[PDB]
Amino acid sequence: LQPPPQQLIVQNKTIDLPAVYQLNGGEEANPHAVKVLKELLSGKMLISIGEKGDKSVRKYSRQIPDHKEGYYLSVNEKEIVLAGNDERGTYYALQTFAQLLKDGKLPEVEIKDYPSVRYRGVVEGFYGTPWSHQARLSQLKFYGKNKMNTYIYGPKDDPYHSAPNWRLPYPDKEAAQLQELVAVANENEVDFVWAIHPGQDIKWNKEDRDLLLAKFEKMYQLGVRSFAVFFDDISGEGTNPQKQAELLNYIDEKFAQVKPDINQLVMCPTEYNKSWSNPNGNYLTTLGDKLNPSIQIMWTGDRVISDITRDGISWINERIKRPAYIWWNFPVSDYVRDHLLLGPVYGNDTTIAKEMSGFVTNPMEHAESSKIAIYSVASYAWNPAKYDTWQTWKDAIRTILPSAAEELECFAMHNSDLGPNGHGYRREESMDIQPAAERFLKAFKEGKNYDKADFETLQYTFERMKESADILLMNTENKPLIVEITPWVHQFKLTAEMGEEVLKMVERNESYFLRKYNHVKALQQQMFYIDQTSNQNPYQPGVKTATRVIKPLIDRTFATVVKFFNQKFNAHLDATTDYMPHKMLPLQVKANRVLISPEIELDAIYPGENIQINSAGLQKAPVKFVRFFVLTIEK
Ligand SMILES: CC(=O)N[C@H]1/C(=N/O)O[C@H](CO)[C@@H](O)[C@@H]1O
């Protein structure tokens, strides 16, 4: 069961799902929950479904937890009970019930369940290509299955979300799409929260306030019932906390508290993590004091990218005078775009549920791939006391890709770290093989003999990686997932082939070694060609994989064996580990830039564009040699 329930008593009997059944409370329970129950009983004992207060569930009123979104669930030989404290609770009972049913069978169980954190879900809030409409449809259904009740729409690059077109209603096509997303959100018990991001060019006047409210009104007409205003990542007048708080309170008093049926009203502050706060400035205490108490305030932790600690959340809660609504910046990869972040969710304090109003994850622009972290976050926010990092990661993968779960585990296990970055945030990766790696390498470098078992583990790892990559490439169960990851799967296969060949180099005679060495060089060039043609975004272009432990191991082993060979045979083989066509500290190629890692000869004459050192326009001059750090060319 994911999320794990608050309380579970298991009998180790099982019963058959009733072929004949009496349904009770069908006409009066949450229709969303009844429809789910009706699909499970498709094709087909008393079955009682309802909310506390329905006649159907009167007998169980004392067992239904007294919590928002709580439910009581029971399966024995005589009857099944599915009883929410409220309509969403009934739906949630059904989502648990759906996981109990396996091959027409049910375990005898009794569950009392409820979430520890009130708002749980996803903020689509990253920079990059916004999720596709089809991907959002898929996400919403995923959220309902995992008891996430919150979807905050706010892609930084949607021009109708952010500046200047925040002021304009969505075009007809986009409008009808959002209208469909809201309906689907509603059917899956998810609050569609529409965010606006106006602060970079907002004027503190009646004109812009009215345009904002008019925009909120248009969204309301599309079916939207929760709203957010984001003031993150801006400078200038829009950073004024008094004005922000006045605007939010106006929205609250003239809009949210005036419509019949508005739910969440959320803001993200300009000072949205501690490092970006001014402890000595008046910004957060002003919001805390002035913002109306029903309005939620978002927080990403001690840093833009960070895990949530007891001390960290105490710090913010004391200032905002309410429990922070956490905006968790993982697995978002918009600042390490050459990486996929597919590892487990961990690092968040599991005892601080009372200290947060909400917990949402900011995911990758890769929607399907983000489901691993999203599933885990749903498990963590619902039952943080029972949260199990590794089991939930494994459960997520088996959920997303049952036909190739182990292959996806293999790929994800080695695609979890971010590499060095300006946010200082890192994750573990390849932890299984890390000790056999460091040992193999330490011994190897010193001239000491390595353990054969360690050499075999590495060998076994490369073999498994190639099986996993080729199987994932051909998988048709979740095509959108395969599309997202495919460039990384190719790079991951090359990595493993490169590992096997390097290991063969450590292992016969001069001729054989030279074959292996030339093969390694060709594989390096192939990796370079993938890094240069795939995922060519303006920020971190290319495709990096197994970067924490596996690639450094392979590279360092390769450099070492080439050195020993050169000493033994008095040779001059090139030991460099990344392919570079241009000659020169390693050079790097990024899009049409050639740079020296913080005289040069290009492999051809190109028209020059510019040169920047830490600048001169080259006005298209033919160029092949630069002597005296980035050269831009036409390419
Ligand atoms: C509140 C917030 O996190 N705003 C942005 C952010 N600000 O530092 O960092 C994230 C990771 O780069 C971005 O995806 C977010 O859109």
Ordered by start, the domain boundaries in the chain are: 1-114, 115-400, 401-635
| Contact status, residue 339 vs residue 371, Cβ threshold 8 Å | no
Q: Which of 158, 233, 388, 555 is catalytic?
A: 233
Cis peptide before 164 (omega within 30 of 0): yes
Q: Are 164 and 94 in contact (CB under 8 A)?
A: no
| Distance from the alpha carbon of residue 353 to the mean position of ligand 1, in angstroms | 23
Q: How far apart are the first and last CA of the chain?
A: 53
**Residue 233 near ligand 1, beta carbon < 6 Å:** yes
- Alpha helix segments (H runs only) across 305-388: 310-320, 371-382
152 lines ligand 1 (CB under 6 A): no
Contact 55, 117 (CB under 8 A): no
Task: Judge if the beta carbon of residue 241 lies within 6 A of ligand 1.
Answer: no
Q: Find the helix or strand (DSSP H, E) in which 177 lies.
A: helix 172-187
Give yes or no for a contact between 288 and 317, defined as CB atoms under 8 angstroms apart.
Answer: no
Do the annotations mark residue 232 as ligand-binding?
Answer: yes
Total residues found in the chain within this entry: 635
Q: Is the CB of residue 244 below 6 angstroms from any atom belonging to ligand 1?
A: no
User: Residue 395 belongs to what H/E stretch?
Assistant: helix 389-400
User: For residue 514, how far is the Cα from the chain centroid?
Assistant: 43
Peptide bond into 331 cis (omega under 30): yes
CB distance 440 to 455 below 8 Å = yes
Resolution in Å equals 2.0
Rg (Cα) of the chain, in Å, rounded?
28
Domain 115-400, what fold? TIM Barrel (3.20.20)
CA distance 227 to 191: 10
Nearest CA owner, ligand 1 atom 8: 304
Residue 304 CA: nearest ligand 1 atom is 8
Nearest Cα to Cα of residue 37 among 52, 56, 50: 50
Three-state DSSP class for residue 75: strand
CA nearest neighbour of 469 among 404, 554, 528, 516: 404
Burial class from Cβ neighbours inside 10 Å (0-12, 13-18, 19+) for residue 104 reads exposed
* Dihedral of alpha carbons 564, 567, 568, 573, sign: positive
Cα of 156 to ligand 1 centre, how many Å?
Answer: 9
**627, HSE (Cβ side, Cα atoms, 13 Å):** 1
Cα separation, 45 vs 118, whole angstroms: 35
Using an 8 Å Cβ cutoff, are 560 and 517 in contact? no
φ/ψ of residue 260, rounded to 5 = -75, -20
Say if ligand 1 is within 6 A of residue 124 CB. no
Q: For a substitution probing ligand 1, which of 157, 161, 200, 232 has the most ligand atoms within 8 Å of its CB?
A: 232
Q: Is 226 in the pocket of ligand 1 (CB under 6 A)?
A: no
- Method of structure determination: X-ray
**Is the Cβ atom of 535 under 6 angstroms away from ligand 1?**
no
Largest CA distance in the chain: 90
Q: Which residues contact 165 (CB under 8 A, 6 or more apart)?
A: 159
What count of other Cβ atoms lies within 10 Å of the Cβ of residue 356?
A: 25
- Does ligand 1 lie within 6 Å of residue 462's CB atom? no
Q: Which two tokens stand for residue 177?
A: 């799409």
Helix (H, G, I), strand (E, B) or coil at 204: coil
Cβ atoms within 10 Å, residue 447: 7
Residue 583's SS3 state is strand
Whether 103 is catalytic: no
271 lines ligand 1 (CB under 6 A): no
Q: Please indicate if the annotation marks 570 as binding a ligand.
A: no
Domain 1-114 is of which CATH architecture? 2-Layer Sandwich (3.30)
Choice from 123, 127, 276 to test ligand 1 binding pocket (greatest atom count within 8 A of CB):
127
> Measured in angstroms, how far is the CA atom of residue 420 from the centroid of ligand 1?
18
Q: How far is CA 99 from the centre of its chain?
A: 23
The H or E element spanning position 409 is helix 405-413
The CATH code for residues 401-635 is: 1.20.58.460
Which is the closest atom of ligand 1 to the Cα of 327?
1
Q: How far is residue 300's CA from residue 533's CA, in Å, rounded to a whole number? A: 34
Closest by alpha carbon to 374, among 147, 624, 606, 43? 147
The kind and range of the H/E element at 511 are helix 510-533
Cα-based distances in Å from 510 to 448, 528, 531, 569: 22, 27, 32, 9
**Which residue has its alpha carbon closest to ligand 1 atom 9?**
304
Pocket test for ligand 1, best of 123, 235, 362 (most atoms within 8 A of CB): 362
Q: Which residues pair with 50 in a beta bridge?
A: 83
d(CA 465, CA 460): 9
Q: How far is the CA of 126 from the centre of ligand 1 (A)?
A: 6
